[PDB]
Scaffold this active site. Structure first.
Site, PDB file in Angstrom:
ATOM      1  N   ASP A 126       1.377  -1.586   0.123  1.00 59.22           N
ATOM      2  CA  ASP A 126       0.309  -0.253   0.070  1.00 59.22           C
ATOM      3  C   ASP A 126       0.815   1.352   0.078  1.00 59.22           C
ATOM      4  O   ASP A 126       0.678   2.165  -1.345  1.00 59.22           O
ATOM      5  CB  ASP A 126      -1.472  -0.226   1.074  1.00 59.22           C
ATOM      6  CG  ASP A 126      -2.243  -1.219   0.966  1.00 59.22           C
ATOM      7  OD1 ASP A 126      -2.311  -1.840   0.306  1.00 59.22           O
ATOM      8  OD2 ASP A 126      -3.116  -1.326   2.000  1.00 59.22           O
ATOM      9  N   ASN A 141      -3.883   9.203   2.048  1.00 65.02           N
ATOM     10  CA  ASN A 141      -4.209   8.518   3.698  1.00 65.02           C
ATOM     11  C   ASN A 141      -4.730   9.400   5.318  1.00 65.02           C
ATOM     12  O   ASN A 141      -5.615   9.041   5.654  1.00 65.02           O
ATOM     13  CB  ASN A 141      -3.289   7.609   4.423  1.00 65.02           C
ATOM     14  CG  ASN A 141      -3.449   6.550   3.371  1.00 65.02           C
ATOM     15  OD1 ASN A 141      -3.710   5.643   3.461  1.00 65.02           O
ATOM     16  ND2 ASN A 141      -1.788   5.158   4.704  1.00 65.02           N
ATOM     17  N   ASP A 142      -3.409   9.796   5.783  1.00 64.08           N
ATOM     18  CA  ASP A 142      -3.391  10.944   6.501  1.00 64.08           C
ATOM     19  C   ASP A 142      -2.673  11.927   6.538  1.00 64.08           C
ATOM     20  O   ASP A 142      -1.558  12.421   5.858  1.00 64.08           O
ATOM     21  CB  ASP A 142      -3.627   9.986   7.752  1.00 64.08           C
ATOM     22  CG  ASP A 142      -2.478   9.120   7.590  1.00 64.08           C
ATOM     23  OD1 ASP A 142      -3.090   8.036   8.215  1.00 64.08           O
ATOM     24  OD2 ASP A 142      -0.997   9.280   7.568  1.00 64.08           O
ATOM     25  N   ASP A 201      -1.142  13.889  22.621  1.00 66.64           N
ATOM     26  CA  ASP A 201       0.026  13.493  21.514  1.00 66.64           C
ATOM     27  C   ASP A 201       0.756  14.532  20.540  1.00 66.64           C
ATOM     28  O   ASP A 201       1.518  14.760  19.612  1.00 66.64           O
ATOM     29  CB  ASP A 201       0.413  11.791  21.689  1.00 66.64           C
ATOM     30  CG  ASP A 201       1.240  11.000  22.545  1.00 66.64           C
ATOM     31  OD1 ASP A 201       0.904  11.556  23.754  1.00 66.64           O
ATOM     32  OD2 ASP A 201       1.562  10.310  22.990  1.00 66.64           O
ATOM     33  N   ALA A 238      -5.127   2.545   8.738  1.00 72.44           N
ATOM     34  CA  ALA A 238      -3.451   2.531   8.914  1.00 72.44           C
ATOM     35  C   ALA A 238      -4.017   2.959   9.829  1.00 72.44           C
ATOM     36  O   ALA A 238      -4.471   2.662  11.002  1.00 72.44           O
ATOM     37  CB  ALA A 238      -3.191   3.364   8.204  1.00 72.44           C
ATOM     38  N   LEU A 284      -6.654   3.638  12.675  1.00 73.87           N
ATOM     39  CA  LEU A 284      -6.779   2.528  13.398  1.00 73.87           C
ATOM     40  C   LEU A 284      -6.567   1.828  14.341  1.00 73.87           C
ATOM     41  O   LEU A 284      -6.836   1.335  15.338  1.00 73.87           O
ATOM     42  CB  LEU A 284      -7.373   1.674  12.771  1.00 73.87           C
ATOM     43  CG  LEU A 284      -8.368  -0.121  13.075  1.00 73.87           C
ATOM     44  CD1 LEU A 284      -9.316  -0.036  12.257  1.00 73.87           C
ATOM     45  CD2 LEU A 284      -7.732  -1.015  11.623  1.00 73.87           C
ATOM     46  N   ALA A 321      -3.641   9.645  22.427  1.00 78.67           N
ATOM     47  CA  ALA A 321      -3.661   9.926  23.390  1.00 78.67           C
ATOM     48  C   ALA A 321      -3.852  10.646  24.408  1.00 78.67           C
ATOM     49  O   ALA A 321      -2.851  11.054  24.955  1.00 78.67           O
ATOM     50  CB  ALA A 321      -1.994   9.288  23.684  1.00 78.67           C
TER      51      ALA A 321
END
Lengths: 256, 256
Positions: free
Chosen positions: B51, B119-120, B149, B161, B164, B184
């Site tokens: 990927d 993706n992100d 964080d 990715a 999740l 977090a």
């Protein structure tokens, strides 16, 4: 009575206020920065700062030496008194009227040497790193395996710090356990494991990753061995002290 | 057909055996790394790797040029065939037996310039750093605040990715949404927020923290604007391709 006083960087003048009040009934034998290296021996150490400060003072303390923290910074779990309660402190002290908690360290052994942690130890990938295969081997048992960013191994004290942010339980400080918490694992393994504090834990990773001891970077390793130390700090509490008031006020857990 | 082949750094060998096979019926007009620079125009781009590779290749594809990924191993969300499946693929190619799929990018503007991600994008403190105040302001609304964080902003594709790993939902690739996941945070805010794909998001942090784009680190920023781009990649799938088989097989979610 013989008392050392240790304070956080920008709280010196606060430290000075406390020193003069305490000087009326006791001898203050040492006064300095929780930063300065060096062993401190006293019948009692007063710490001006927060959990961070108490942590640094705990590592300076002659094994045994009770300590007491005055909230200078914010609310934490290792501070016992506010500054407006100083007269209460002097009264409790007079009669030694305290609950004493034992907080024990963990001992970490690796290629970087031997470290001591009061909260936790962390193995974690670089930001630029791919996830890692991590093997967690408790006592004589077969292994648990994780493909993850890392793993945190925590003491009851440290349960309310980083480990809590990633899903761990709130562990009451009297519990005789260690806590193991994978960081961002695949296969949804975001649960911590609680073991007896008399079990040791070996952690191995497929490649070297970063080790943090109580949150301080310390080097890269493929392998650590962790167990409960016999070194411990003693924390004096006022008789009314209630840890559950802190879980509510500071963690926001269980508010009405 | 005029075909360009792109392989991951190490997979020069799988690229080579895909290249000899494809040349028996077609013309390889370009053969090289997917990480190498330059726009690539062809009738088809064949990508060997995982990927990660497709992701880098999607950035190179001329708006239009359909893509198809090959994976060395177990099937992945962005690949369509395994490296033994060359038989069926060349079959499908010859007959254009394909399901056509399109995935849009996101657009990130910040201090550092303008980035594209399939993706992100992640803002995240150093390993050594304290937690940070983060302000999230969706399109028109008032702000959501976290002490954390960092935060991950993901497309439907990127939902499987890093998002999740940290608690996010599995978002099917056809949903017209963006996902916001804090990393977090304190006060137990480990839940993602899902918003329509036509809303922009601004993220502000109390200090410069690291920015990762599609998992590639890009530098330090204190402010980002994310929105859906008009740009997209198209991916060819065999009619039998099922995304849920992958959720089961690769993610581990929902096996009988």
């Amino acid at each position: 009575m013989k008392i050392a006083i240790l304070y956080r960087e920008e709280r010196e003048k606060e430290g000075e206020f406390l020193k003069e009040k305490i000087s009326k009934e006791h001898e203050v034998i040492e006064f300095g920065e929780a930063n300065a290296p060096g062993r401190v021996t006293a019948d009692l150490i007063v710490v001006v700062g927060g959990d961070g400060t108490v942590l640094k003072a705990a590592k300076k303390a002659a094994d045994g030496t009770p300590m007491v923290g005055f909230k200078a910074g914010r609310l934490g779990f290792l501070t016992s008194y506010t500054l407006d309660e100083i007269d209460r402190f002097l009264e409790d002290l007079r009669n030694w009227n305290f609950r004493e908690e034992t907080r024990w360290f963990i001992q970490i052994e690796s290629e970087l040497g031997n470290h001591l942690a009061l909260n936790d130890v962390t193995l974690e990938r670089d930001l630029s790193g791919k996830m890692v295969e991590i093997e967690v081997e408790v006592e004589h048992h077969s292994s648990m395996w994780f493909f993850a960013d890392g793993v945190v191994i925590s003491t009851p004290t440290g349960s309310t710090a980083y480990s809590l942010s990633i899903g761990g339980p709130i562990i009451f400080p009297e519990c005789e356990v260690l806590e193991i918490s994978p960081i961002a694992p695949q296969f949804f393994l975001t649960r911590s494991v609680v073991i007896p504090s008399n079990f040791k834990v070996v952690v191995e990773s497929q490649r070297d990753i970063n080790m943090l001891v109580d949150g301080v970077l310390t080097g890269k390793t493929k392998r650590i061995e962790v167990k409960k130390s016999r070194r411990y700090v003693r924390i004096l509490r006022p008789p009314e002290y209630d840890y559950v008031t802190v879980i509510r006020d500071k963690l926001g857990y269980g508010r009405r």
